[PDB]
Amino acid sequence: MTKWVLHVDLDQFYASVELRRRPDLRGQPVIVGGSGDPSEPRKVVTTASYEAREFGVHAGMPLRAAARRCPDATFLPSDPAAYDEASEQVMGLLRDLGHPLEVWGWDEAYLGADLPDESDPVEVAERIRTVVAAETGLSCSVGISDNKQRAKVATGFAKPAGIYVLTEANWMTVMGDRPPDALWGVGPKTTKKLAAMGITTVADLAVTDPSVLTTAFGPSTGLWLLLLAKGGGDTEVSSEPWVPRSRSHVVTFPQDLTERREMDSAVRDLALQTLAEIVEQGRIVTRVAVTVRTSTFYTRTKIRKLPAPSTDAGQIVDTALAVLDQFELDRPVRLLGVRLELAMDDV
DNA sequence: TAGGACCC
DNA sequence: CTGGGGTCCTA
Ligand SMILES: Nc1ccn([C@H]2C[C@H](O)[C@@H](COP(=O)(O)NP(=O)(O)OP(=O)(O)O)O2)c(=O)n1
Ligand SMILES: [Mg+2]
Ligand SMILES: [Mg+2]
């Protein structure tokens, strides 16, 4: 027997949800983000269709930047309520195949299938793709392996509308010549540090001395970076419901603020909007954090713990404004944010 | 508590 | 020019 980890990720998620109700746009570049107005600044692309992506438009790109690259593109406002309902339709369907399923964000899910050696995991992936296609109209891609991070990397090669199997038989074959940030968990900043140390590929990272990576990244991050290069990762798929450790709300304003009454007002409204939402889900606040971005993108965040776990609205607003006054507040502010950290439950 | 570094 | 919402680790 072999314990396979299957990673399901939805193709161009937000675009496909819109394309499902707009057959007029089937072949045209569709861009989701910020009220559907490409003139608006400080708004970014949250999804670009595969057609729009061939123009170089990707997630996080400003709307006006995307308008420059693809003028022919239909811009749609983001509709989170529609994406949530499409997400639960997909996921409430992925649990009813009788497998351990670890939901991971709206777009992705890890599925555990302990199959006999004579049985092919591709047959499970082939089923997943078309029960999702036949009952939601959305297309997915499945990555197959024996750990989450490698199944995740396998999904990248399966896109679009495909399946890709990645194992130790072909791991270093496929990934050896790739840069470090091709692994899940390592990004641009670590890849830059490794390049300055002579490590430029996954293969070179996999045979790097541990007491060279640990004394450069941390005692456990160093060894974890070494596992990842070897194709290892997390192997337990847990169907337990995830409990959020915190919830937050941030806003970038159209023009940078200057008056503090507006800053005291934004922090208070953000704090009360977040508090009302955690009360609804039955949570209790432990600490209050406030974030300031400034025009030069200098963002730091301060946090204060409450005397006791509370959800009192007067106390949390007072605490948020008290953390805000702890801030220097010289330059114009670009973004203010409130994050309420939640007591790690009970029932 | 602060802050860097991922990721969707 | 550089959104919004999360989490884990390290100093
Ligand atoms: N930086 C990002 C990345 C994704 N998202 C949202 C929008 C995505 O449609 C959705 C799915 O995340 P994603 O799989 O990484 N990208 P997306 O599914 O849109 O395109 P592909 O998976 O086909 O490459 O999360 C976001 O809001 N900001
Ligand atoms: Mg996706
Ligand atoms: Mg995804």
DSSP A10-39: ETTHHHHHHHHH-GGGTTS-EEE-GGG-TT
Return the nearest residue to B8, CA–C1'.
Answer: A105
Q: Within 10 Å of residue A92's Cβ, how many Cβ atoms?
A: 9
DSSP state of A126: H
For tokens 């204060």, what's the residue? Answer: A304
User: CA A151, CA A234: separation in Å to the nearest integer?
Assistant: 10
* A9 annotated to a ligand binding site: yes
Strands A108-115 and A101-104: antiparallel
Smallest-distance ligand from the CA of A46? 1
The phi-psi region of residue A257 (left if phi > 0; otherwise alpha if psi is between -120 and 50; otherwise beta) is beta
Enumerate the β-bridge partners of residue A278.
Answer: none
Torsion of CA A21, A44, A178, A186, to 10 degrees: -110
Tell me the CA–centroid distance for residue A8 and ligand 2, in Å.
Answer: 9
**Which sign, positive or negative, has the C-alpha torsion A123, A124, A128, A134?**
positive
* Buried-state track A4-34, b at ≥16 Cβ within 10 A, e below 16: bbbbbbbbbbbbbbbbeeeeebeeebbbbbb
CA distances from A270 to A221, A240, A301, A320 (A): 34, 30, 15, 10
The phi-psi region of residue A33 (left if phi > 0; otherwise alpha if psi is between -120 and 50; otherwise beta) is left
Tell me the CA–centroid distance for residue A28 and ligand 2, in Å.
Answer: 19
**Does the C-beta of A107 come within 7 A of strand B?**
yes
Contact criterion met (CB below 8 Å) for A311 and A279: yes
| First and final C-alpha spacing in chain A | 37
Q: Which nucleotide is nearest to A63 (CA to C1')?
A: C3
Q: How was this structure determined?
A: X-ray
> Counting every residue, how long is chain A?
347
For residue A72, the Cα-to-chain-centroid distance in whole angstroms is 28
